[PDB]
């Protein structure tokens, strides 16, 4: 599984203490899964800047999901996710940074709430995109299909609806079944 994936995580102040704890949880629990893999990681915080928390030679130094994650500062400003997704196009997918030329490239978007920016994003075309939209924000039909526009296709299989963030949990659990 030579993947190089990253984590693209919503630090919005639509995020409680708690729920911002159980994202980077969910974060930690799915690298310390797959650390005896050829998966390789890397995390973008975004709210209304950009900040990568690690990027993969990080990763590779020790592949300690804790130690990783441990500075992390909750940015609790806006959500301007279309220009995330080009920041991590552009910025942490860099051979320069760690990531492999011949990996596949991954990208999970975390939120919990509609964006607050526009922008093209097609610079991430080469990436398999994930989303996860998480909480009542996106309790409708109408406000879940607002994030088929950043993920694959079909949204049918890239798109996950958490109706809440325990359900990150039960999530983590449901993909690991897949991989046997
Ligand atoms: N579905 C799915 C997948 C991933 C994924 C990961 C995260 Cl963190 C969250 C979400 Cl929403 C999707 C992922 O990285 N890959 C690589 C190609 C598709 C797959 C395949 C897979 C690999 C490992 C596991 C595990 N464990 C399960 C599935």
Redesign the pocket.
């Known amino acids: 599984?030579n993947?190089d994936?990253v984590f693209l995580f919503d630090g919005s102040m639509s995020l409680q203490p708690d729920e911002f704890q159980k994202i980077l949880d969910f974060m930690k629990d799915?690298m310390k899964?797959?650390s005896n893999t050829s998966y390789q990681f890397a995390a973008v915080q975004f709210s209304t800047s950009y900040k990568t928390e690690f990027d993969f030679s990080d990763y590779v130094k020790r592949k300690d999901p804790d130690a990783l994650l441990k500075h992390v500062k909750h940015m609790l400003l806006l959500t301007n996710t279309f220009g995330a997704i080009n920041y991590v196009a552009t910025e942490v997918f860099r051979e320069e940074l760690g990531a492999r030329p011949d990996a596949?490239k991954?990208l999970?978007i975390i939120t919990d709430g509609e964006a607050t920016d526009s922008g093209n994003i097609d610079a991430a075309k080469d990436i398999?995109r994930?989303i996860?939209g998480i909480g009542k924000h996106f309790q409708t039909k109408e406000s879940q299909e607002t994030l088929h526009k950043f993920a694959s296709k079909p949204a049918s299989e890239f798109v996950?609806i958490l109706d809440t963030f325990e359900k990150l949990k039960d999530?983590f659990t449901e993909?690991?079944k897949?991989?046997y």
């Open positions: 599984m993947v994936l799915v899964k797959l596949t991954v999970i398999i994930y996860i996950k999530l993909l690991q897949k991989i």
